[PDB]
Design a protein around this ligand. Structure first.
Ligand SMILES: CC(C)CCC[C@@H](C)[C@H]1CC[C@H]2[C@@H]3CC=C4C[C@@H](O)CC[C@]4(C)[C@H]3CC[C@]12C
Ligand SMILES: CC(C)CCC[C@@H](C)[C@H]1CC[C@H]2[C@@H]3CC=C4C[C@@H](O)CC[C@]4(C)[C@H]3CC[C@]12C
Ligand SMILES: CC(C)CCC[C@@H](C)[C@H]1CC[C@H]2[C@@H]3CC=C4C[C@@H](O)CC[C@]4(C)[C@H]3CC[C@]12C
Ligand SMILES: CCCCCCCC/C=C/CCCCCCCC(=O)OC[C@@H](O)CO
Ligand SMILES: CCCCCCCC/C=C/CCCCCCCC(=O)OC[C@@H](O)CO
Ligand SMILES: CCCCCCCC/C=C/CCCCCCCC(=O)OC[C@@H](O)CO
Ligand SMILES: CCCCCCCC/C=C\CCCCCCCC(=O)OC[C@@H](O)CO
Ligand SMILES: CCCCCCCC/C=C\CCCCCCCC(=O)OC[C@@H](O)CO
Ligand SMILES: CCCCCCCC/C=C\CCCCCCCC(=O)OC[C@@H](O)CO
Ligand SMILES: CCCCCCCC/C=C\CCCCCCCC(=O)OC[C@@H](O)CO
Ligand SMILES: CCCCCCCC/C=C\CCCCCCCC(=O)OC[C@@H](O)CO
Ligand SMILES: CCCCCCCC/C=C\CCCCCCCC(=O)OC[C@@H](O)CO
Ligand SMILES: *C/C=C(C)/C=C/C=C(C)/C=C/C1=C(C)CCCC1(C)C
Ligand SMILES: *C/C=C(C)/C=C/C=C(C)/C=C/C1=C(C)CCCC1(C)C
Ligand SMILES: *C/C=C(C)/C=C/C=C(C)/C=C/C1=C(C)CCCC1(C)C
Lengths: 225, 225, 225
């Protein structure tokens, strides 16, 4: 069988595009308002939703996908565009909260590299036509746990060391992030991995997560400067 | 119909390759002549024409293209190689003149990111098989205007603030750049966009522009240190 | 004919994967042992064998390759994955020894860029379906010689200037590196270039070289801190 997106998925792509694009314009206003030395979280958060807006437009316009054979015998549309999005946006999301903590660049570096490895191995698993897809998935899950360790140990120490409003903002955003980001490997296991849920279900599920992880998250970042 | 390059286009690729490659060797001599602390514009300008030489060789040797369906029903050879070129060379061209101005890195950053977005969205539009090609094009045109705003407002302020020979060199190069770079979205509208002009006409038109934007421009940069 | 890997090549991929992966875990232990300010060669060497482990897994799992027409009339499986590996790992290998020398960043920059050009032009040659493959190869060989010049002239001067244990370590590693890295364009000439040796012979030959260039080399780096 050929498993591709339905109407419900395409509308979710357009809805999600609109949310990201609106957020991008808003955050551009809010950022270029602020003085040059105060723009860091602005630039980062703007870049997150701008890149996601570009990816969502692409997917809504029937780009950024390729039909890939799953070992169950179906051809499934793999939205490689989402991984390109995540390659830039997930390190940016992490930096948005890591920058609160003042930890050394050396520590931040291995957290973001654990994150890019996570995404890249997911991509490779998604483009695999065979059972070795699951080795990619499992090692990527290990790297996700490296990222979480980074957030809840050295990152957390940094935030508590700074004190003031930093711990509340950091633990609030990091706790939300940590819990939310578990949605992604779950959806992947069900979608690109096992070809169990429909591509519409996949698209809608990743869209909901992306709205939570970028729109909700981003507005929270932007509204607490 | 299948729209591909003719002989006139391939010779223009070889001619343009020769011009870039000659310029690269010359600029390598001129740069490694100069002392380590004086090499910046040298390295940048060398990199521009070296990368363009590699891209032009590739296209002359029948690489860097894929046949893509245009909604008019023709298959058109899209030279994705040129966009890979532009991804590196257009930020480098901008840096070549932005470095004259001493503006903050924060400003330079959003100018180059506006530029990379411009190129990338052009690529996506070029690889699109449907009418959403024009949304890519229009937003990319907006980003081009962001780049020009960067050059003619903060960049321009920086140059005038420095004074001396900087304003004359900056406004001369930036004015030439600004006007010349309008050629690209015009050609694209006629070529990758609408499939209106032949691929030979496309190749020749982008070649002429590239010779002006890199060979002429580069020699002007290199001959005013 | 269709030239693809046999069993001997796939086992060599798994063996090589195991060696890289073991080395990655070991080097992770050794690096996160050391204090934050002493981790540079650790991080670099860890990254080398981690990336190679990912590439070798991919190739062992039948990814990272595409069938490409050689002008001799055969279709040959080109392992583009190896070039993606080399794009990151060969600059990292160079930095691992260049960091001993204290030379200016400006010099290190053109050495690594000569190296990335070398790899990229090899990739382009490998993906070429025609005789222009050899122009890519020859220019890439020139860039290899640029890299070696970098190592044996400014890099070497830096090392001798520092003195102490640096010259012995630098010249030992650089001499080994220089000689060993000649294996790659030889194998390429025989494999991706001319389609003369089998893909199994290719895989085994690049694996042997990679084990020498990353496992042996990496253990030597890690065991001389
Ligand atoms: C910023 C840089 C370093 C990384 C971002 C670019 C990466 C993630 C991009 C660049 C080119 C992309 C690939 C180009 C072409 C295809 C063909 C299709 O059948 C499957 C997806 C696949 C294979 C893409 C996957 C994502 C990709 C690998
Ligand atoms: C330096 C990094 C971050 C960016 C530069 C690399 C980008 C622009 C390159 C990497 C791989 C490239 C893609 C790889 C394969 C194909 C297949 C072809 O049918 C259409 C072009 C397309 C899709 C290429 C377009 C350009 C591309 C996306
Ligand atoms: C870190 C960034 C800047 C560079 C690393 C990414 C580059 C080297 C990667 C990104 C996408 C890759 C390409 C994507 C798709 C294909 C299709 C296949 O038929 C031939 C290989 C080819 C064409 C790949 C070659 C390597 C590639 C170009
Ligand atoms: C048919 C479908 C079935 C496929 C099943 C495969 C699923 C595999 C799941 C993987 C579990 C995650 C493994 C990860 C286990 C932890 C590894 C680790 O070292 O990371 C933590 C530290 O680095 C922190 O410092
Ligand atoms: C059949 C072919 C017809 C297709 C027509 C589509 C062409 C669309 C053209 C686009 C016009 C350019 C829109 C750009 C308008 C300006 C947007 C903007 O905000 O940028 C300026 C500021 O950022 C500066 O600070
Ligand atoms: C059928 C197969 C036959 C194909 C033959 C093609 C092989 C071509 C081989 C290339 C030889 C290498 C050329 C390289 C020659 C040196 C060029 C150079 O300037 O580099 C050195 C300096 O930069 C150092 O500072
Ligand atoms: C700043 C610019 C960086 C943009 C990175 C966005 C990459 C997101 C999606 C890839 C879309 C591929 C779109 C490809 C369209 C071809 C079908
Ligand atoms: C065919 C129709 C099946 C429609 C299935 C629709 C499934 C929607 C799942 C969803 O929206 O989850 C959002 C959360 O992840 C937000 O946190
Ligand atoms: C320094 C090295 C960076 C080189 C970047 C040049 C990329 C330019 C053109 C892509 C050519 C693809 C050439 C692909 C040949 C395969 C047909
Ligand atoms: C088939 C033959 C049609 C040949 C069309 C040849 C069209 C050449 C256009 C050109 O060279 O423009 C150069 C400028 O952009 C430089 O600024
Ligand atoms: C840190 C993460 C960077 C990983 C870079 C490793 C790239 C190595 C090999 C490409 C494998 C492509 C694997 C593609 C699998 C699709 C068949
Ligand atoms: C079919 C069987 C042919 C098997 C050919 C096997 C050829 C193995 C060559 C090799 O392992 O070289 C290693 C060195 O490069 C290490 O420095
Ligand atoms: C805006 C997008 C976000 C926050 C995306 C996050 C994605 C992840 C946390 C993905 C994780 C994955 C794994 C842990 C294993 C398998 C592949 C995944 C990439 C989807
Ligand atoms: C050496 C190459 C140069 C200076 C190339 C410049 C290219 C541009 C200014 C391209 C601009 C584009 C748009 C404004 C919209 C549509 C896509 C374009 C990429 C060709
Ligand atoms: C761990 C991997 C290593 C050290 C790979 C090294 C690869 C090279 C030195 C490759 C060189 C090449 C040329 C000089 C010309 C033709 C293409 C090559 C890429 C294989």
């Amino acid at each position: 069988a050929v498993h591709q997106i339905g109407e419900g998925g395409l509308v979710m792509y357009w809805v999600t595009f609109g949310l990201m694009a609106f957020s991008a314009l808003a955050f551009a206003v809010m950022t270029f308002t602020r003085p040059l030395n105060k723009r860091s979280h602005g630039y980062i958060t703007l870049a997150i939703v701008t890149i996601a807006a570009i990816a969502y437009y692409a997917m809504a316009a029937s780009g950024g996908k390729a039909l890939v054979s799953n070992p169950d015998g179906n051809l499934r549309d793999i939205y490689y565009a989402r991984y390109i999005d995540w390659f830039f946006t997930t390190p940016l999301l992490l930096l948005d909260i890591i920058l609160l903590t003042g930890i050394p660049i050396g520590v931040t570096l291995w957290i973001v590299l654990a994150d890019v490895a996570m995404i890249m191995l997911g991509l490779f698993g998604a483009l695999s036509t065979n059972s070795y897809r699951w080795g990619y998935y499992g090692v990527s899950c290990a790297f996700f746990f490296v990222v979480l360790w980074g957030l809840f140990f050295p990152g957390a120490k940094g935030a508590r060391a700074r004190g003031g409003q930093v711990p509340g903002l950091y633990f609030g955003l990091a706790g939300y992030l940590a819990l939310l980001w578990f949605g992604y490997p779950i959806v992947w296991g069900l979608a690109e991995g096992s070809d169990y849920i429909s591509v519409t279900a996949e698209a809608a599920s990743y869209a909901g997560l992306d709205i939570a992880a970028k729109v909700v998250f981003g507005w929270a970042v932007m509204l607490s400067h």
